[PDB]
Design a protein around this nucleic acid. Structure first.
Ligand SMILES: [Mg+2]
Ligand SMILES: [Mg+2]
Ligand SMILES: [Mg+2]
Ligand SMILES: [Mg+2]
Ligand SMILES: [Mg+2]
Ligand SMILES: [Mg+2]
Ligand SMILES: [Mg+2]
Ligand SMILES: [Mg+2]
Ligand SMILES: [Mg+2]
Ligand SMILES: [Mg+2]
Ligand SMILES: [Mg+2]
Ligand SMILES: [Mg+2]
Ligand SMILES: [Mg+2]
Ligand SMILES: [Mg+2]
Ligand SMILES: [Mg+2]
Ligand SMILES: [Mg+2]
Ligand SMILES: [Mg+2]
Ligand SMILES: [Mg+2]
Ligand SMILES: [Mg+2]
Ligand SMILES: [Mg+2]
Ligand SMILES: [Mg+2]
Ligand SMILES: [Mg+2]
Ligand SMILES: [Mg+2]
Ligand SMILES: [Mg+2]
Ligand SMILES: [Mg+2]
Ligand SMILES: [Mg+2]
Ligand SMILES: [Mg+2]
Ligand SMILES: [Mg+2]
Ligand SMILES: [Mg+2]
Ligand SMILES: [Mg+2]
Ligand SMILES: [Mg+2]
Ligand SMILES: [Mg+2]
Ligand SMILES: [Mg+2]
Ligand SMILES: [Mg+2]
Ligand SMILES: [Mg+2]
Ligand SMILES: [Mg+2]
Ligand SMILES: [Mg+2]
Ligand SMILES: [Mg+2]
Lengths: 131, 146, 188, 159, 260
RNA sequence: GCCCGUCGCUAGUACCGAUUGAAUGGCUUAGUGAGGCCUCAGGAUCUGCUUAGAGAAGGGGGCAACUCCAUCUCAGAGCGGA
RNA sequence: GGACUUUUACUUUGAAAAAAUUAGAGUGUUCAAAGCAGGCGUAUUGCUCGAAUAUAUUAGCAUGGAAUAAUAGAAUAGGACG
RNA sequence: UAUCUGGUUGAUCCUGCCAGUAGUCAUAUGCUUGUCUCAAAGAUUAAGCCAUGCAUGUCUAAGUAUAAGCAAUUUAUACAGUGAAACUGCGAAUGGCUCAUUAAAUCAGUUAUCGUUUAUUUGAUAGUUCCUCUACAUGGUAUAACUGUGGUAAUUCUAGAGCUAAUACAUGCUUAAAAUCUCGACCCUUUGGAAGAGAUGUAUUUAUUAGAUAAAAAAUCAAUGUCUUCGGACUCUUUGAUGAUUCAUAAUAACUUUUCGAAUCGCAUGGCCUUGUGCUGGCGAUGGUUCAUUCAAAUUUCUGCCCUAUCAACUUUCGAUGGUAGGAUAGUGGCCUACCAUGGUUUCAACGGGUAACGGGGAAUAAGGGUUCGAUUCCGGAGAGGGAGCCUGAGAAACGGCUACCA
């Protein structure tokens, strides 16, 4: 009779499961950002969709809307603090253009690679997990 | 329903503790208690200069009007000292973005003060279970037909 | 035992309803007292939330009020003589509220004399003082006075014996007295 | 092994619905009644035992009974119970009159005696004095606030 | 349910206490007392949740069984005493006094106050009535009955009781434009002048309330608690002065304060 | 070329069907009716007042003389209670 | 200045409204699902923001509206107003 | 977060399904299984059956210790530390489990109590108790534990004999001053007037009465009122709540197998002066009547439920709808009864049937609209093998309570 430690699934698999052009596109990312499996791409794919959905919703509202304004600039504020949204792409129209790698780049995976330290994403991997 | 000769019951008919001293000679042969109903319900002449008893009248009797106050239209007066109102209304059905005609009959005890018949729109007021089915009491009657 | 729930009824539509739950104590009813005239017997009963009621079983002598004379005297209660509800209560001289009974006239006879100074229907100084004042208001009802002749008065129980164990009642006066009298001459 | 019950009659065993303060039953919670089996009040051959209590003492001398005699265990403990045991008076002071019984440690002997209850103590007479006064102290105070307000309301038209 | 309930599942508990979802199955559940259990604050909450003086629950009865704490003057030892609105609570062994006066969200502020003031508190009169023996009496919200009051006080007026002696010392009427506290409802925690009381014969009169920053709003008659003349409180008010600031505005006040 | 139906083999499904077919549950006529509960009684056992007389106390105030509250021992006799 | 719809539907705005769940703001649980925490300093007898907000699509209550759609009303005037 | 693809032809384009695809707080099963957090789990079928253990007991300085307990030796010759057992008190009506029943029922929002009960908590509340020679420096019995004499194969079975306590049981004193009332000795007759005797707490039962008020002037009868210029005069005269009441409250005449008004406990042990173990005295505990508060309960207004007409009329059997009276209840009410009427529901779907139906919060499915689900962490409900009945208590129609039938 306690209280549920609530939970949530982080990803979502695609509808049509055998698009070759998606499986090519998918495999590519896995290799350059050093990914283990498709689920790591799905998880992010899912992320983006909630952002775009949250975004595209506020846009239907008239501006000056205290919710839109509060809950829009908030999103934008978070999206920038991580480096997914550019320092002057701070408009809801612009968060909608966010593509998958925007997030993928900011990966502490790809960062141990970028600024020296690794000179390989698949070196950056084992570098991180091996503490 | 009808209006009796008051003492048409095997028990004598009187308001409680509204004493008439026979020692003292009086103009009116009886003392009539009545009260102000409430909610700007102006109490009727029939209630005051009548001789009916009805311990279930909102005036002259020991029932009080409190809670909801309802309008409906008289639809059956065949009962004695009580009638059947009908309240019609529209129910919203979210799926079809539309309405359907519903209704409910609700039995109200009509004071002998009012002389209400079928068709008369009637204002009633909630008043504590007066019977198995009656919880509302006639308190105002609007026009008829003509 | 008994229950006062409405559940076991039909609905107005006429539908029989299925039993919804078992009977709870907080809806019970009890058997009646059917109190008769006799030696003061009164059982009590522990009711809802502590509390008592008193089952008047046998009763003589209740407290009675001559309301158009301002006094109350404890009388004796002869028998039951009417009952609007059920004539069975009369045949069995059972005392309930609204009973209509005969009561001993002589507690009131005694007060009337010593008060108004006048013997009822057939010395000292400050005694005759008060009398002359109280008189010119000493004449009572015609139908009430005649009752003292035989020694019994027509009263009406206003207590609830199976609740409080008291058989109190006002002596019938005025129009109310006419009515019941009118009924005793189409039955008794 | 079934006890007789005073007042049944019968020479048989029957089954009563026993309640509190009745023989042969001892309730295990308030309001518990138990259909228990008891034995008749009339004497038969089916008794393991029969209990007798001697009322009139016979010619000869019953060795186990008449000859010997056992002490009561405890003596009086209540105030006047001490008294009407020794035939005493109101102002007679109990205290040095109670029953004492001495206890042996191993070699170290010492005595014991009942706390007298219902005893009149200097303390008790103080409590009466308090309450008796407390009641009046307040009663006069009440009149004060009463007679005051009664004059606060006088000036509620006279002002 | 066959009789009185004695437990309280840790979610049915009043939200404004701010218990955490986990920790256990249960919440304190108020004792019977001066305040309605949903509008109250157990001492156990105050001492260990609001005051953080205690850790355990055991270490609260620890404190309480030491008479270290007194509510409205009197020493209260019950782990879950239903302390509520306008109350005082005094910790002698650390010379601090409080007043259970509402937040502006709707919670119980740790609004510490002086040793002056602590000797009184307000009290909305709930009913004023003629007791037995011709005596009169008022009944404040906190479950106090004070006999012999001013014939001027009617219902919904507040009253400055003492605190050590009972006794009403001055009182405020309910009328156009008095300083009002809101004790519950959506607008719980607000504070301001009145303007209008909308009478509704039958049930539920409504009180339109203006604040110092000109923000009109409505509540129900019992939700309103008069506390003084306009701008002139009869007691200390917590920080923020019961103003209600929009979450927009709220955002600034925090991040702008941060930095230096 | 397509193709309809009888008739013929195998398997499955449902339907009809003597058996005044069978089972389980709800409601229920008639008859019978436990139990506690209320009531008229009963009275194993207990016991509260009262009353004439009887054996042993202390003086409401006394020249002999008078007469209260309590406590208690056995033949009796009136009214009630658990 | 206060109440006021002939009688309704409708619509606007509120109030009375449990928590969790959901939407969602803040917070670097090392990330995350979470959680409602925490953050600062002389860290040797301290300081400090919080624990928001939206929600609810019937019915009831309160309120701004009167287009749309119903409805009442003077005709043998038992018409209105003073 | 708005997508379709495979299968009827020789080929075509449609209709139309079948099949594919994706998720499922969606169960099972298969195969595989290293690490961190998180942690559901005998609901579905059988509200089927259950061995055994456990799941409800409870003591403060503050109700009752002669334990033939223990420890010390208290200052303790009434008791005094600790303390089994037992009495007393309270609790066992919360919790936890399950979803069988239940389809206008429950339940949800929204109301009602001017329709009732309420242990407790919190705040208020008591001078009145006998009586025309009295215990109140404190009345009286009985019981347990225990002792000892026992019964039964058997249990939380118990008999008969003997002891002894209370905040258990049963009795029962008390406290100022005034006022108003009736009774009226008597004297002295007039504009007359009074001695002194009773009554008067609360609660109970009944009747009667006040509880006024939108704006004013007179004539009197019945009965007695301050007075004054002994002619006749009488002003500033009193009263609360509600939208609404026979409301709160007060008064009168009485009523009652007469309710309550401390025969209790712990710490303190100071102060008056007549020196009595006189008088007074503090903090607190537990009690107590009434009211309020609180935690509740019980009825209750309005609106809202799935499939079904191969269910169209239903309801008064043996109450169905209403009226009057009573009984009963904590109280409203056909809740029950007596008497009286013939009413009540329905195609705006009554009534009946079905549900592999507890209701809701909520869950799965992401264009929108919808579709499907909710035994199950929170709320409400019900039930404890099936039925019924009741004891105790503030609260149960209780089941780790009892009684009976059934299994
Ligand atoms: Mg009829
Ligand atoms: Mg709508
Ligand atoms: Mg019945
Ligand atoms: Mg059931
Ligand atoms: Mg608690
Ligand atoms: Mg067949
Ligand atoms: Mg509410
Ligand atoms: Mg409107
Ligand atoms: Mg082909
Ligand atoms: Mg398919
Ligand atoms: Mg389960
Ligand atoms: Mg099962
Ligand atoms: Mg439970
Ligand atoms: Mg109890
Ligand atoms: Mg005894
Ligand atoms: Mg005796
Ligand atoms: Mg005894
Ligand atoms: Mg014995
Ligand atoms: Mg008034
Ligand atoms: Mg009254
Ligand atoms: Mg106490
Ligand atoms: Mg429903
Ligand atoms: Mg069929
Ligand atoms: Mg009733
Ligand atoms: Mg009836
Ligand atoms: Mg018929
Ligand atoms: Mg019907
Ligand atoms: Mg369902
Ligand atoms: Mg089911
Ligand atoms: Mg459910
Ligand atoms: Mg459902
Ligand atoms: Mg199931
Ligand atoms: Mg149950
Ligand atoms: Mg079972
Ligand atoms: Mg109990
Ligand atoms: Mg149980
Ligand atoms: Mg049961
Ligand atoms: Mg069990």
């Amino acid at each position: 009779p306690r209280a549920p430690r609530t939970y949530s699934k982080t990803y979502s698999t695609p509808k049509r499961p055998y698009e070759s052009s998606r499986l090519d596109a998918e495999l590519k990312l896995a290799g350059e950002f050093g990914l283990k499996n498709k689920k790591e791409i799905y998880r992010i794919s899912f992320q983006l969709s909630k952002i775009r959905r949250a975004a595209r919703d506020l846009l239907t509202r008239d501006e000056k809307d205290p919710k839109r304004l509060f809950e829009g600039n908030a999103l934008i504020r978070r999206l920038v603090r991580v480096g997914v949204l550019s320092e002057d792409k701070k408009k809801l129209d612009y968060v909608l253009a966010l593509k998958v790698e925007d997030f993928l780049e900011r990966r502490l995976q790809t960062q141990v690679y970028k600024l020296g330290l690794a000179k390989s994403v698949h070196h950056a991997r084992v570098l991180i997990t091996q503490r | 329903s009808t209006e009796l000769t008051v003492q048409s019951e095997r028990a004598f008919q009187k308001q409680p503790h509204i004493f008439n001293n026979p020692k003292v000679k009086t103009s009116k042969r009886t003392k009539r208690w009545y009260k102000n109903a409430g909610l700007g319900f102006k109490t009727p002449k029939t209630a005051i200069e009548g001789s009916y008893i009805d311990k279930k009248c909102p005036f002259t009797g020991l029932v009080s009007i409190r809670g909801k106050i309802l309008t409906g239209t008289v639809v059956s007066t065949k009962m004695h000292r009580t009638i059947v109102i009908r309240r019609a209304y529209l129910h919203y059905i979210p799926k079809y973005n539309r309405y359907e005609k519903r209704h409910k009959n609700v039995p109200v005890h009509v004071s002998p003060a009012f002389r209400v018949q079928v068709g008369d729109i009637v204002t009633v007021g909630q008043c504590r279970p007066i019977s198995k089915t009656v919880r509302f009491n006639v308190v105002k009657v609007s026009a008829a037909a003509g | 035992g008994i229950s006062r729930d409405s559940r076991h009824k039909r609905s107005a539509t006429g539908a029989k309803r299925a039993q919804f739950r078992k009977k709870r104590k907080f809806e019970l009813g009890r058997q009646p007292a059917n109190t008769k005239i006799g030696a003061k017997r009164i059982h009590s009963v522990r009711t809802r939330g502590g509390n008592k009621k008193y089952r008047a079983l046998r009763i003589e002598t209740g407290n009675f009020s001559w309301a158009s004379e301002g006094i109350s005297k404890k009388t004796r209660i002869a028998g039951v003589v009417y009952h609007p509800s059920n004539n069975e209560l009369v045949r069995t001289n059972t005392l309930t509220k609204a009973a209509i009974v005969q009561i001993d006239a002589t507690p009131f006879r005694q007060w009337f004399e010593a008060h108004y100074g006048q013997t009822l229907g057939k010395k000292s100084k400050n005694a005759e003082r008060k009398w002359a004042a109280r008189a010119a208001s000493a004449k009572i009802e015609s139908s009430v006075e005649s009752q003292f002749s035989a020694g019994r008065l027509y009263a009406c129980i206003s207590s609830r014996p199976g609740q409080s164990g008291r058989c109190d009642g006002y002596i019938l006066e005025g129009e109310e007295l006419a009515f019941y009298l009118r009924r005793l001459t189409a039955k008794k | 092994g079934f006890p007789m019950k005073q007042g049944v009659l019968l020479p048989t065993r029957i089954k009563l619905l026993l309640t509190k303060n009745v023989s042969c039953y001892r309730p295990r919670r308030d309001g518990e009644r138990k259909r228990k089996s008891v034995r008749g009040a009339i004497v038969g051959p089916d008794l393991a035992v029969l209990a007798l209590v001697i009322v009139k003492k016979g010619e000869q001398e019953l060795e186990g009974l008449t000859d010997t005699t056992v002490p009561k265990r405890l003596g009086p403990k209540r105030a006047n119970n001490i008294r009407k045991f020794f035939g005493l008076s109101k102002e007679d002071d109990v205290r040095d009159f109670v029953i004492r019984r001495e206890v042996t440690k191993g070699e170290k002997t010492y005595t014991k005696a009942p706390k007298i209850q219902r005893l009149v103590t200097p303390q008790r007479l103080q409590r009466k004095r308090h309450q008796r006064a407390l009641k009046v102290r307040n009663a006069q105070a009440q009149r004060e606030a009463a007679a005051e307000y009664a004059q606060l309301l006088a000036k509620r038209l006279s002002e | 349910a066959r009789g009185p309930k004695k437990h309280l599942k840790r979610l049915a508990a009043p939200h404004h206490w701010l218990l955490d979802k986990l920790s256990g199955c249960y919440a304190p559940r108020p004792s019977a007392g001066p305040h309605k259990l949903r509008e109250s604050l157990p001492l156990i909450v105050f001492l260990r949740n609001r005051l953080k003086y205690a850790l355990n629950g055991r270490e609260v009865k620890a404190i309480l069984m030491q008479r270290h704490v007194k509510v409205d003057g009197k020493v209260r030892t019950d782990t879950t005493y239903p302390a509520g609105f306008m109350d005082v609570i005094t910790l002698d062994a650390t010379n601090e006094n409080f007043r259970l006066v509402y937040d502006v969200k709707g919670r119980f502020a740790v609004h510490r106050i002086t040793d002056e003031e602590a000797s009184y508190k307000l009290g909305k009169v709930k009913k004023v009535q003629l007791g037995k023996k011709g005596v009169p009496y008022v009944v404040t919200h906190d479950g106090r009955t004070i006999r012999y009051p001013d014939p001027n006080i009617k219902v919904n007026d507040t009253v400055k009781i003492d605190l050590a002696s009972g006794k009403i010392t001055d009182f405020i009427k309910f009328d156009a434009g008095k300083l009002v506290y809101v004790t519950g409802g959506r607008n719980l925690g607000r504070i301001g002048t009145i303007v209008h009381k909308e009478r509704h014969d039958g049930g539920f009169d409504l009180v339109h309330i203006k604040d110092s920053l000109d923000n009109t709003f409505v509540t129900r008659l019992n939700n309103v608690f008069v506390i003084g003349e306009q701008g002139k409180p009869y007691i200390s008010l917590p920080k923020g002065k019961g103003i209600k600031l929009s979450i927009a505005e709220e955002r600034d006040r925090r991040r702008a304060q941060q930095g230096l």
